[PDB]
């Protein structure tokens, strides 16, 4: 049973899906489960009472949105099962789970219990013929067409700098933080309350994400922007009322570089990138500096790459050629790589078959990934 395999690229913020050997993921939607706050009085209302994807985006105000996955670690397993069921259902894929092999993705260095429980869901609840979990950095390099280079990424949950050199993903040199787009959105929400405009509701939380996506920019010199007084630019909400954003827009994405502002000890994106290069061998450092690939949604801030280049110039040894490259479609970089990896004839060897899982168990899944 070697049908066209499916590539479900997981993520805390957004979840991508579709078939192998494709240019773009056809099925992209945000990873959450909306449920109705209000009392459904009238007959002929929205049926089901568990909303995922575009229906939930259309009917935000009704639904109490909650995310199942934080920092690449699922909290609510029943919610992720409903999301995966919605992916396979007629509203999105129009396929059965029994036909196609599965390509899953996860952030590196996660708890193994969650990886085991993920496999249990795919093999038992769904009747998958073969499963395969993989890295995000390895796929992003397959999407670009390079083998050597570091992959800095920044989704909604995790930020991790994985160094790879000619098909050798060093498991030891992988740096990681639990600081990312969701924490930046939460930090921007806190700043908007300091400005004046309070947002506490779960449906109203996605307006803060929309403001973060649209009206934000990362300054090169933060001390210079602190001394100067801001212009206070405007933005229209979904309702109609205008909001002067003020200094919150530029101080919000500083969290990624300065993790002390939220109140939690971490390295930072720029430190993690330097740190992933340093932990590798001495001969391979200069090739890793030359090939730095960006990925994820939280790398799309204005003057983000320029700030990363300046931070590398400050920390790294002098007289070294720095190059932070990036693809055009930074959001769909990991999925394209999975679609390429799935289309290859080698893919049959790497996967965990259902028969092999039934015989061995979790140990076979731990062996095949690394």
């Amino acid at each position: 049973i070697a049908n066209q395999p499916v590539v479900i690229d997981n993520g805390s913020g957004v979840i991508k899906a579709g078939f192998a050997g494709d240019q773009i993921p056809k099925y992209c939607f945000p990873n959450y489960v909306g449920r109705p706050k209000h009392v459904r009085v009238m007959a002929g209302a929205l049926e089901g009472d568990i909303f995922i994807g575009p229906k939930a985006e259309e009917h935000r105000g009704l639904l109490s949105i909650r995310y199942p996955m934080e920092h690449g670690i699922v909290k609510d397993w029943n919610d992720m099962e409903r999301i995966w069921q919605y992916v396979y259902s007629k509203e999105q894929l129009q396929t059965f789970s029994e036909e196609h092999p599965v390509l899953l993705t996860e952030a590196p260095l996660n708890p193994r219990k969650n990886r085991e429980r993920a496999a249990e869901v795919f093999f038992e609840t769904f009747n998958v013929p073969a499963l395969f979990i993989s890295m995000q950095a390895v796929l992003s390099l397959y999407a670009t067409g390079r083998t050597t280079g570091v992959v800095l990424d920044s989704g909604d949950g995790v930020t991790h700098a994985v160094p790879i050199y000619e098909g050798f993903a060093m498991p030891h040199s992988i740096m990681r933080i639990d600081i990312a787009g969701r924490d930046v959105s939460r930090f921007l929400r806190l700043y908007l309350r300091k400005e004046g405009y309070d947002f506490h509701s779960s449906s109203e939380f996605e307006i803060v994400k929309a403001i973060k996506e649209r009206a934000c920019y990362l300054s090169i010199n933060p001390q210079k922007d602190e001394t100067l007084e801001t212009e206070k630019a405007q933005y229209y909400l979904p309702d109609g009322s205008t909001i002067e954003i003020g200094p919150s827009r530029f101080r919000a994405p500083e969290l990624l570089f300065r993790p002390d502002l939220i109140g939690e000890e971490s390295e930072g994106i720029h430190e993690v990138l330097v740190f992933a290069i340093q932990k590798s061998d001495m001969d391979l450092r200069r090739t890793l500096f030359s090939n730095i690939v960006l990925s994820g949604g939280s790398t799309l801030f204005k003057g983000f790459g320029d700030r990363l280049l300046s931070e590398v110039k400050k920390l790294a040894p002098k007289d070294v050629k720095i190059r932070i490259s990036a693809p055009q479609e930074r959001l769909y970089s990991t999925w394209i790589g999975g679609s390429i990896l799935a289309s290859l004839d080698t893919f049959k060897k790497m996967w965990v078959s259902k028969k092999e899982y039934e015989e061995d168990g979790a140990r076979s899944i731990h062996r095949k990934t690394f």
Binding site: E271, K279, R367
Partner: protein, 270 residues
């Protein structure tokens, strides 16, 4: 004998840093002509001193010491009492008292224990300080350990514009002992040194010591995180790479992955 000093420094860089005092004393026994050179060049754990008039501990360095006696930062006096010791200026002494008080609150927040000391020696173009800290771990626990600061800073005050070129040289001398988990006992000894220079404009609100402090805080957060990794980056790959039981099953897989990557390599291109 310049090669002897190079070898002496090379030897202290390879012997355990836990026994610097014993090995340095023996190294001076073996080379008595280099005694003055080695005492200046070889960094060693900081000595504890006690100010009897105030009833407080201070720390000892080469810079604060003048001859056989050491200026206490609390009383401004040397023990044993020298007749005409090398004191700072009355303005710098007042600044030095404010340094001690500021870095007292510094240490007490980061460690919540141990002892510190701050001494600033007067220069014509500048004011140059030493910030010593010594924190001991839980003695009752089987895991022993300490953390030692040797932040030396040099501030070049400019004439016009009120700006100041800072030059921080920071050493961090650590020894973690780990005796737990019923699996054995490991003792890890670190010693990284990092340099940082900066020109900052002087504020009337915040004095120059606060500007120095900002370098210490940022340096300590970075040195600590750098240290932290140099521990794991080596203790992980090296030890795991030597005795990995999962190396032999993954070696067969890696050889399969070698055929696979090679098939991927051709297909990535076209």
């Amino acid at each position: 004998s310049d090669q002897q000093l190079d070898c002496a420094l090379d030897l202290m860089r390879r012997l355990p840093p836990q026994q610097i005092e014993k090995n340095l004393s023996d190294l001076i026994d073996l080379v008595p002509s280099l005694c003055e050179d080695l005492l200046s060049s070889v960094d060693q754990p900081l000595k504890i001193a006690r100010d009897k008039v105030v009833g407080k501990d201070y720390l000892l360095c080469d810079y604060n010491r003048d001859g056989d006696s050491y200026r206490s930062p609390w009383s401004n006096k040397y023990d044993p009492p020298l007749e005409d010791g090398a004191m700072p200026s009355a303005r710098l002494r007042k600044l030095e008292v404010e340094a001690n008080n500021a870095f007292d609150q510094y240490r007490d927040l980061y460690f919540e224990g141990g002892v510190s000391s701050v001494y600033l020696w007067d220069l014509d173009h500048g004011f140059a300080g030493v910030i010593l800290i010594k924190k001991a771990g839980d003695g009752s626990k089987k895991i022993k350990g300490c953390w030692d600061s040797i932040h030396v800073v040099e501030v070049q005050e400019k004439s016009s514009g009120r700006t100041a070129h800072y030059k921080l040289t920071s050493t961090v001398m650590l020894w973690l002992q780990t005796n737990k988990s019923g699996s054995g006992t490991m003792n890890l000894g670190g010693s990284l040194t990092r340099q940082m220079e900066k020109d900052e404009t002087v504020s009337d609100c915040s004095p120059h010591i606060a500007n120095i402090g900002r370098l210490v805080e940022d340096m300590e957060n970075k040195i600590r995180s750098t240290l932290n990794e140099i521990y794991f980056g080596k203790t992980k790959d090296i030890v795991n790479g030597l005795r990995s039981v999962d190396v032999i099953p993954d070696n067969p897989k890696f050889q399969q992955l070698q055929r696979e990557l090679s098939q991927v390599l051709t297909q990535r291109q076209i």
